[PDB]
Ligand binder design. Structure first.
Ligand SMILES: O=C(O)Cc1cccc(OCCCN(Cc2cccc(C(F)(F)F)c2Cl)CC(c2ccccc2)c2ccccc2)c1
Ligand SMILES: O=C(O)Cc1cccc(OCCCN(Cc2cccc(C(F)(F)F)c2Cl)CC(c2ccccc2)c2ccccc2)c1
Lengths: 241, 232
C-alpha cells in the first residue's frame, strides 16, 4: 500500500470510531425499550417503534458527519453531497447493521449494549418483507469476515456512486470513487492473497444493498398506509411527501 | 486462460450470436390516444422478442440446467429486465443518440415518450446506455457479465442460493482472468464492470415503478410480459 492509501484508510477508520464514541455517549439519552408485561397492546408497539426511530436518528446524524470526513466529499457541490447522502444513508445503515449482527445469537447490537432479536423488530411493527432480507444480508456479510479497513472502504465506495438520482456531476463522483476502489483492491490482495474472489464478493454486496434500499422504500410506504409518521430528520430523507 | 475457461467463454459468445442471428412480424409503427397505444403495442412486441432471446440464451449457459425448475424460473424472472437493459445499451448509437432493435427498427428519446413511457424511466435508461458505451465491453465481457447477472443468489424466491452462488463463481473467475490478460494496464476494468450490476438493480426498481404506473393508467402488458412483471 502507498502512504496515501494507508492515510486514507486511517482517516476513514478514525472517523468511524468517533461516530461509535458518539453512539456510546447517546445510548443513555434513548427512551428505554419497554420491558413491560409486553401485553400485545398498541401502546407498547408504538414505544418499540419510536425507540427504534431514535437509534435510526442517531445513525443518520453520524453518517452526515462521517461523510464530511471522507476525503473528497467536500469537493462536490452541496447539491450533490445532499443527493449522495439521501440515497446512500439507508445503505450505509444496512452495512453498519450487518457488521453488528452476531451469527451465534442471531441478534444485532446497536450503540454500545442494546441487543435485539428477530422478534424484537417484529414487535415494533416492522413487516416480514423488511425484517427477513435484512437478516439474510447480515449473515451473508458475516461470511466475508470484513475487518475495519474493509467496511470503511466499502462505505466510502457506496457514498461515491455516480448513478444516484439528481446528481449533477456524476463523472466527478465516479472519479472520487476510484481511489477507494483501488485501495480496497490493493488491501484485499495483501490481506488474503489466496482468496481472489473476496474483492468481487464485497462489491457484489453493493448490488444487494440496492435491492434492500427498495425494500426499505416499501416499508416506509407501508408506514404511510398505516398512519405511522416518521420523525422530522427521517421524514426529510425518506418520505416522498 | 485454461482450456475449460476458454471453452466456457466461447460457449457464451457463440450462444449469444446464435440467439441473435435466429431472431419476427410486428405491429406497425405509426398525437392521438389510438397512436400512443400503437407505439406502445409495438415496443411491447419488440420486448417479447428480446425475452425469447434471453430465455433461449440462459438455457445454454453452463450451470443453468443443473438448477431446479423453480430456481430457473426465479433467476430468469429477475434477470430478464436487467439483461434487456444491457442489450439495449449495446444497441445505442452514440452518434445518432438512437437505439436500434432487430437490425432495422430505430428510435430516439422522443419516440419512447410518444409511446407513453415515464420520463423517470426513459432518462435513466439513456444515461445507463451511454455509460455502458464508454466502458466499451467486448463480446466476451458482455456475455460473461450476463451469466454473472443470471446467477445472483439473492433474487426473490431462490431455494438453493448456495448452489446459485457456487455456479456464479467460475464466471466471475473467468471474467477476472479475461480482463487481466486482455487489459493488463487497466486494473479497475473488472470492478467497473461489476459496478454496472449495481446500476442494473436500481434500473430494475425503476422498471417496477413503470409497470405500476401502467396498471393505474389502464395500460396492459401483453400476456408473455405479464407473466414476468405483473403481481399475482
Ligand atoms: O448502532 C450504532 O452505533 C449506530 C447505528 C448504526 C446502524 C443502525 C442503527 O440503528 C438502526 C435502528 C433499527 N432500525 C430502525 C430503522 C432504520 C431505518 C428505517 C426505519 C423505518 F423507516 F422503518 F422507520 C427504521 Cl424503524 C431497524 C433495522 C432493522 C434490522 C433488522 C431487521 C429490520 C430492521 C434497520 C433497518 C434498516 C437499516 C438498518 C437497520 C444505529
Ligand atoms: O432488437 C433486438 O434484437 C432484440 C431486443 C433487445 C433489447 C430490447 C428489445 O426491445 C425493445 C423494447 C423497447 N422498450 C419496451 C419495454 C421494455 C421493457 C419493459 C417495458 C414496460 F414494462 F414498460 F412495458 C417496455 Cl414498454 C423500452 C426500452 C426503453 C429504452 C429507452 C428508454 C425507455 C425505454 C427498454 C426499457 C427497459 C429495458 C430495455 C429497453 C428487443
Amino acid at each position: 500500500l502507498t502512504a496515501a492509501q494507508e492515510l486514507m484508510i486511517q482517516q476513514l477508520v478514525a472517523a468511524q470510531l468517533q461516530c461509535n464514541k458518539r453512539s456510546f455517549s447517546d445510548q443513555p439519552k434513548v427512551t428505554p425499550w419497554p420491558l413491560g408485561a409486553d401485553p400485545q397492546s398498541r401502546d407498547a408497539r408504538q414505544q418499540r417503534f419510536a425507540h427504534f426511530t431514535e437509534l435510526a436518528i442517531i445513525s443518520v446524524q453520524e453518517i452526515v458527519d462521517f461523510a464530511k470526513q471522507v476525503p473528497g466529499f467536500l469537493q462536490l457541490g452541496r447539491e450533490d453531497q445532499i443527493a449522495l447522502l439521501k440515497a446512500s444513508t439507508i445503505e450505509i445503515m444496512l452495512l453498519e447493521t450487518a457488521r453488528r449482527y452476531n451469527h451465534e445469537t442471531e441478534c444485532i447490537t446497536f450503540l454500545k449494549d442494546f441487543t435485539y432479536s428477530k422478534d424484537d423488530f417484529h414487535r415494533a411493527g416492522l413487516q416480514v418483507e423488511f425484517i427477513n432480507p435484512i437478516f439474510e444480508f447480515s449473515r451473508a456479510m458475516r461470511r466475508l469476515g470484513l475487518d475495519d479497513a474493509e467496511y470503511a472502504l466499502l462505505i466510502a465506495i457506496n457514498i461515491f456512486s455516480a448513478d444516484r438520482p439528481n446528481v449533477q456531476e456524476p463523472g466527478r463522483v465516479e472519479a472520487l470513487q476510484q481511489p477507494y476502489v483501488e485501495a480496497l483492491l490493493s488491501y484485499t490482495r495483501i490481506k488474503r492473497p489466496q482468496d481472489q474472489l473476496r474483492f468481487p464478493r464485497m462489491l457484489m454486496k453493493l448490488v444487494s444493498l440496492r435491492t434492500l434500499s427498495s425494500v426499505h422504500s416499501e416499508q416506509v410506504f407501508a408506514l404511510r398506509l398505516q398512519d405511522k409518521k416518521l420523525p422530522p430528520l427521517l421524514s426529510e430523507i425518506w418520505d416522498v411527501h
